[PDB]
Enzyme design. Structure first.
Site, PDB file in Angstrom:
ATOM      1  N   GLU A  35       7.767   9.219  -7.083  1.00 44.15           N
ATOM      2  CA  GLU A  35       7.385   8.308  -6.007  1.00 44.15           C
ATOM      3  C   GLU A  35       6.916   6.952  -6.538  1.00 44.15           C
ATOM      4  OE1 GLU A  35       7.602   8.772  -2.674  1.00 44.15           O
ATOM      5  OE2 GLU A  35       7.977  10.913  -2.424  1.00 44.15           O
ATOM      6  N   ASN A  46       9.617   0.153   4.153  1.00 41.34           N
ATOM      7  CA  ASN A  46      10.616   1.002   4.796  1.00 41.34           C
ATOM      8  C   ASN A  46      11.380   0.206   5.856  1.00 41.34           C
ATOM      9  OD1 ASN A  46       9.661   3.422   3.361  1.00 41.34           O
ATOM     10  ND2 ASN A  46       7.900   3.384   4.760  1.00 41.34           N
ATOM     11  N   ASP A  48      11.933   0.806   8.941  1.00 39.54           N
ATOM     12  CA  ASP A  48      11.296   0.758  10.251  1.00 39.54           C
ATOM     13  C   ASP A  48      10.143  -0.247  10.333  1.00 39.54           C
ATOM     14  OD1 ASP A  48       9.190   2.000   8.854  1.00 39.54           O
ATOM     15  OD2 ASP A  48       9.280   3.870   9.972  1.00 39.54           O
ATOM     16  N   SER A  50       7.249   0.032   8.406  1.00 42.22           N
ATOM     17  CA  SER A  50       6.088   0.562   7.702  1.00 42.22           C
ATOM     18  C   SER A  50       6.217   0.322   6.192  1.00 42.22           C
ATOM     19  CB  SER A  50       5.911   2.045   8.016  1.00 42.22           C
ATOM     20  OG  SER A  50       7.039   2.762   7.601  1.00 42.22           O
ATOM     21  N   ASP A  52       4.880   2.093   2.190  1.00 43.50           N
ATOM     22  CA  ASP A  52       4.318   3.211   1.425  1.00 43.50           C
ATOM     23  C   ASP A  52       3.468   2.688   0.265  1.00 43.50           C
ATOM     24  OD1 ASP A  52       6.020   4.836   3.072  1.00 43.50           O
ATOM     25  OD2 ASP A  52       7.625   4.612   1.589  1.00 43.50           O
ATOM     26  N   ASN A  59       2.322   6.687   3.650  1.00 40.73           N
ATOM     27  CA  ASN A  59       3.064   5.877   4.612  1.00 40.73           C
ATOM     28  C   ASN A  59       2.133   5.278   5.664  1.00 40.73           C
ATOM     29  OD1 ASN A  59       4.960   4.719   6.271  1.00 40.73           O
ATOM     30  ND2 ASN A  59       6.311   6.507   6.344  1.00 40.73           N
TER      31      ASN A  59
END
Ligand SMILES: [Br-]
Ligand SMILES: [Br-]
Ligand SMILES: [Br-]
Ligand SMILES: [Br-]
Ligand SMILES: [Br-]
Ligand SMILES: [Br-]
Ligand SMILES: [Br-]
Ligand code: NA
Length: 129
Positions: A35, A46, A48, A50, A52, A59
């Site tokens: 990650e 991301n 959409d 958002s 991380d 998130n």
């Protein structure tokens, strides 16, 4: 801060992650590697809208507040910047809540795709624990 492998293992163990909810220490070290590459300052946007954050790429849609994700929740009740400290305490406490929500570690897509079903013990092999 970019942790070393055995350093992050010991830090996770001290914060009570080893075998939390049945997941051995190698699962968590593997998940951090893919990650974030062990970098507590890692961020990724991301599609959409958002973002991380941190060593476990938590998130902003659900878990932390960054002030730029319309309609998100803040279920760990934390600013997303706290997930980027060189101390991993906030990241660990939020991961314990994520992994208890019902889907286990499948919440981390890289874990499911790159760690699940592998020899996860190799990630703590040779570490002084
Ligand atoms: Br490594
Ligand atoms: Br927001
Ligand atoms: Br922005
Ligand atoms: Br909330
Ligand atoms: Br730490
Ligand atoms: Br589970
Ligand atoms: Br293990
Ligand atoms: Na949020």
């Amino acid at each position: 801060k970019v942790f070393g492998r055995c350093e992050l293992a010991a830090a996770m163990k001290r914060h009570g992650l080893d075998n939390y909810r049945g997941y051995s220490l190698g699962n968590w070290v593997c998940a951090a590697k893919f990650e974030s590459n062990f970098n507590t300052q890692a961020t990724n946007r991301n599609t959409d809208g958002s973002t991380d954050y941190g060593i476990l790429q938590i998130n902003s849609r659900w878990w932390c507040n960054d002030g730029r994700t319309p309609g998100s929740r803040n279920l760990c009740n934390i600013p997303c910047s706290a997930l980027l400290s060189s101390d991993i305490t906030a990241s660990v406490n939020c991961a314990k809540k994520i992994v208890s929500d019902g889907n286990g570690m499948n919440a981390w897509v890289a874990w499911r795709n790159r760690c699940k079903g592998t020899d996860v013990q190799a990630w703590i092999r040779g570490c002084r624990l």
